[PDB]
Amino acid sequence: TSWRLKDETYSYDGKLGADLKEEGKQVDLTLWSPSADKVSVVVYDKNDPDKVVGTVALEKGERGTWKQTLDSTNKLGITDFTGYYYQYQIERQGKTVLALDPYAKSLAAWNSDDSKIDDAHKVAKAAFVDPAKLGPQDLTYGKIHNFKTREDAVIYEAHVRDFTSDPAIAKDLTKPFGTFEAFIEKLDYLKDLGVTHIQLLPVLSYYFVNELKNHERLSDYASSNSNYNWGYDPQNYFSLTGMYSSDPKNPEKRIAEFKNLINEIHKRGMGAILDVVYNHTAKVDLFEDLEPNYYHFMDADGTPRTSFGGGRLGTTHHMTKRLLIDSIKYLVDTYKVDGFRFDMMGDHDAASIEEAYKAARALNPNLIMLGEGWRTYAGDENMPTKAADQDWMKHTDTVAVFSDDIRNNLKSGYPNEGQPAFITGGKRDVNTIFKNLIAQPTNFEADSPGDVIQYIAAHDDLTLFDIIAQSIKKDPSKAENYAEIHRRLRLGNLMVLTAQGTPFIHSGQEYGRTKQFRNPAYRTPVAEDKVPNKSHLLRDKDGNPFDYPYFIHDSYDSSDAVNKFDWTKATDGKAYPENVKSRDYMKGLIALRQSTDAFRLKSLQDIKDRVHLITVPGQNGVEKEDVVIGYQITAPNGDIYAVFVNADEKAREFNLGTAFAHLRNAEVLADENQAGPVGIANPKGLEWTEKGLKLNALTATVLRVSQN
Numbered sequence: 222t223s224w225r226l227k228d229e230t231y232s233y234d235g236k237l238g239a240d241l242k243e244e245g246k247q248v249d250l251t252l253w254s255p256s257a258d259k260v261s262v263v264v265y266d267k268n269d270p271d272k273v274v275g276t277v278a279l280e281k282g283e284r285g286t287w288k289q290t291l292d293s294t295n296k297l298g299i300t301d302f303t304g305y306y307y308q309y310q311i312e313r314q315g316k317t318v319l320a321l322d323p324y325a326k327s328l329a330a331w332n333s334d335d336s337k338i339d340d341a342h343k344v345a346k347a348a349f350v351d352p353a354k355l356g357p358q359d360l361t362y363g364k365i366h367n368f369k370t371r372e373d374a375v376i377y378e379a380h381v382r383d384f385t386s387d388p389a390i391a392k393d394l395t396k397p398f399g400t401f402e403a404f405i406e407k408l409d410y411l412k413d414l415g416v417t418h419i420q421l422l423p424v425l426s427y428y429f430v431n432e433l434k435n436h437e438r439l440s441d442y443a444s445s446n447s448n449y450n451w452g453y454d455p456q457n458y459f460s461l462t463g464m465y466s467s468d469p470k471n472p473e474k475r476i477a478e479f480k481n482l483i484n485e486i487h488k489r490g491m492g493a494i495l496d497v498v499y500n501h502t503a504k505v506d507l508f509e510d511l512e513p514n515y516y517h518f519m520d521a522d523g524t525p526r527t528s529f530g531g532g533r534l535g536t537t538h539h540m541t542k543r544l545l546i547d548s549i550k551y552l553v554d555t556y557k558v559d560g561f562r563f564d565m566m567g568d569h570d571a572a573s574i575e576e577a578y579k580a581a582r583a584l585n586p587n588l589i590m591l592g593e594g595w596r597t598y599a600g601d602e603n604m605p606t607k608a609a610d611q612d613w614m615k616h617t618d619t620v621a622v623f624s625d626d627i628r629n630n631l632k633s634g635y636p637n638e639g640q641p642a643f644i645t646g647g648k649r650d651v652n653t654i655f656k657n658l659i660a661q662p663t664n665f666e667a668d669s670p671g672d673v674i675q676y677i678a679a680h681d682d683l684t685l686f687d688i689i690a691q692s693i694k695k696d697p698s699k700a701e702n703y704a705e706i707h708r709r710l711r712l713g714n715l716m717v718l719t720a721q722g723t724p725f726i727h728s729g730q731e732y733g734r735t736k737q738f739r740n741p742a743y744r745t746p747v748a749e750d751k752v753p754n755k756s757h758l759l760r761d762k763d764g765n766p767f768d769y770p771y772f773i774h775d776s777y778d779s780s781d782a783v784n785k786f787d788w789t790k791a792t793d794g795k796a797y798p799e800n801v802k803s804r805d806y807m808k809g810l811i812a813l814r815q816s817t818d819a820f821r822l823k824s825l826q827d828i829k830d831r832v833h834l835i836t837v838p839g840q841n842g843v844e845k846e847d848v849v850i851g852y853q854i855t856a857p858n859g860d861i862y863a864v865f866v867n868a869d870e871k872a873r874e875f876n877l878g879t880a881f882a883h884l885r886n887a888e889v890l891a892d893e894n895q896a897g898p899v900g901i902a903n904p905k906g907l908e909w910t911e912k913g914l915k916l917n918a919l920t921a922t923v924l925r926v927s928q929n
C-alpha cells in the first residue's frame with residue numbers, strides 16, 4: 222500500500238484513545254489500526270502492573286478503527302477502571318505484537334532496563350486516567366507580567382531535574398529532589414530574575430530510562446551510561462514522563478504535580494514553554510506495530526526512515542499530522558501552557574507547524590512558539606515539501622527560530638566551536654555583528670524581529686562560561702582568568718539582552734554555569750580509553766591542559782554532578798562574588814530591557830528608522846572586522862539609548878563628533894559592575910574623551926539620553 226492511498230481510504234477524524242467516563246465505571250476505547258485482523262486490549266493490575274487481569278477483544282469500526290466499551294458487564298472483576306493499565310494486542314497475518322496506545326493519557330512506571338524480559342516489557346503500558354479531575358482546579362492560561370507579544374518574551378531554558386538536583390539545596394527542599402513539585406520551590410528565584418517564560422526540556426514520556434530509581438542521586442561524575450536523560454528519545458506524546466514524579470507507580474500523580482507546577486509558574490507572573498520532540502520516536506516499532514509502513518516518512522519501498530535510533534514521524538500523513546495537532550491541543554488545554562519549542566523543527570513540513578500554531582492560539586490567544594529551524598528536511602522519498610525551517614521565516618510571522626548567526630558570530634558555533642569570536646578575542650565583521658543585534662541575521666531572511674530567537678548558549682554544547690574558557694584558552698582556576706571570563710560572559714549577555722528579537726537564556730547562563738568533569742581521578746589527562754564521552758580537553762595558550770581538563774559538551778547522558786544547577790554559585794554573594802555579580806547583571810539587563818520598548822521593536826520598518834550604527838567600519842580606529850561596536854536607538858517615547866561594547870583587551874575609543882554629541886549628558890544604565898533601568902550614580906569603566914568616549918578593556922555600557 223502507500224500512506225497516500227491509506228489516507229484516501231482510512232483517514233479518521235473522530236476521537237482516539239481511552240476515555241474514562243462515569244467516574245471510573247466505563248472506558249470507551251478507540252485505536253486506528255486498518256490492517257489488523259484482530260485487536261484486543263490486555264488489562265494489567267493497578268497494584269501489580271506485571272499482573273494480567275484479563276483480555277477483551279475490540280470490534281471493527283469506521284475508517285480503519287477498532288472500538289470497545291469496558292463497563293459493568295466486564296468479566297475483569299473491575300468496578301473502577303481508574304489507574305489500571307493496558308496495552309493493545311494486535312494480530313496480523315497470524316503474528317501478534319503488543320502496542321502502546323499512541324493517545325495514552327498516562328503510563329505505568331517505566332524501566333527500559335527490563336525491556337528484554339518479554340513482549341509486555343518492550344513498550345510502556347498506558348493507564349486509564351482522567352486529567353480534568355486532577356491537580357489545582359483553578360489552573361488556567363498564564364497572565365504574563367511585562368509581556369504583550371513574542372518580541373516581549375525573555376525565555377529561560379531549564380531541565381526539571383537539573384534545577385533542583387544540587388545536593389547543596391537538599392536542606393531547603395520539602396519535596397523530593399528533581400521532581401515537578403521540587404521545581405516549584407525555586408520558582409521565586411526565576412520570578413526575581415525577571416524572565417517571562419520558562420522553557421522546560423522534554424516532559425513527555427521518553428524511552429531510555431529507569432524511572433524506578435528516580436529518587437537516587439547521581440552523585441558520581443559520569444558522561445555516558447547514566448540513568449539521567451535529557452528526554453530526547455520520545456515514547457508517547459500525551460503522557461508525561463514519570464522521571465520527575467514523586468511517585469512514578471501512581472499514574473495520576475504526575476498529572477496533578479505538573480498541573481500544580483504550571484499553576485505555580487503562573488501565579489508568579491510567568492509562563493511555561495514545553496520542549497516537544499515530534500521529529501523522531503525512540504523506536505521504529507512504537508508506531509510500526511500500530512500500523513505498518515504508515516506513520517513514518519519512508520523510502521519508496523515503504524522502509525521507515527530513521528533519526529537518533531528511532532523513526533521519523535511523517536507529519537504530512539493524515540494520522541501522523543493529527544497526532545501532532547491533537548497532542549499540541551491536548552497539552553495546551555490540559556496543562557494550560559504558554560508555548561512550545563519544536564525540536565529539529567526543520568524535519569517538519571511548514572503546513573503542520575502552521576496549523577499547530579493556529580490550533581494552540583485558538584485555545585490560548587497569547588501562546589508563542591519557536592523551534593530549531595536548521596535545514597534538515599528529509600521527508601518522504603521523492604516528495605519535496607516546504608519545511609518549517611529558517612527559510613520559512615519570510616512566509617510567516619508565527620513560530621520563531623533560533624539564530625545560529627549571532628551565536629556563531631559572538632562566541633563559537635557549529636562547525637567552528639571553540640574558535641575565537643566577537644566576545645572571545647576573534648574579530649568580526651562589524652556590519653554583521655550589527656545586523657545580528659537588530660535581528661536581521663545574514664544566513665536567513667527575518668522580515669520581522671519576532672522571527673528571531675537570539676541566543677549564545679543553550680543545553681546543547683558547552684555552556685557560556687565553558688565555551689569562553691575554551692575559546693580564549695584561559696584556565697578558570699586562576700582567580701584572574703575566572704574574573705576575565707565573567708567580564709566576557711556579561712558582555713555577551715548584555716549584547717543578547719539589548720538586541721532586537723526574542724532573547725533566550727540557558728538556565729545557569731546568568732551565573733556562569735559549568736559542566737567541567739571534576740572527577741577526582743581526572744585532575745589531569747588520562748589514557749585514551751578512559752576519556753569521558755562527549756568531552757573536550759581544555760588547554761591554555763601554551764597547550765598545557767587545564768586543571769581538570771575535561772568538560773562535557775553533550776550532557777544528555779551525564780549525571781547530577783555534571784548537570785545540577787549550582788545554587789551556591791548562583792545565590793551566595795559571599796562565597797562566589799563573581800558568579801553573583803554575573804547573576805545580578807543578568808537580572809538588571811532583563812530589568813533594563815523591560816523598562817522601554819527600544820530593545821524590542823515590533824517591525825522591520827521601525828527598526829530601520831530608529832537604530833543606526835555609530836561605529837562605521839573602516840573609520841575612526843574601527844577596523845572592518847573588529848571586537849567593538851556602538852549604536853543608537855530612538856525609543857518610541859523619544860528617549861535615545863546607545864549600546865557600546867569593547868570586547869578588546871585594551872581601552873578603546875568610540876568616536877561621537879557632532880552627529881552623536883547628544884550622547885554626552887547621557888545617564889549610564891549599564892557599566893562594568895551592574896545594569897538596570899536607572900542611572901548609575903558613579904559609572905565605572907567609562908571615560909569621556911575629546912573625540913567621544915573611552916571604554917575599559919572588556920567592558921560594555923548602555924546610555925539613555927533624555928529630555929525629561
Ligand SMILES: OC[C@H]1NC[C@H](O)[C@@H](O)[C@@H]1O[C@H]1O[C@H](CO)[C@@H](O)[C@H](O)[C@H]1O
Binds near residue numbers: 529
Ligand atoms: O532530539 C535530537 C537533538 N535535537 C536538538 C536537541 O537540542 C538535542 O539535545 C537533541 O540531541 C540530544 O538527544 C539525542 C537523542 O537522545 C542524543 O543522541 C544527542 O547526542 C543529544 O545531544
Ligand SMILES: [Ca+2]
Binds near residue numbers: 614619667668
Ligand atoms: Ca516572518
Ligand code: NA
Binds near residue numbers: 638639682683688774
Ligand atoms: Na561548544
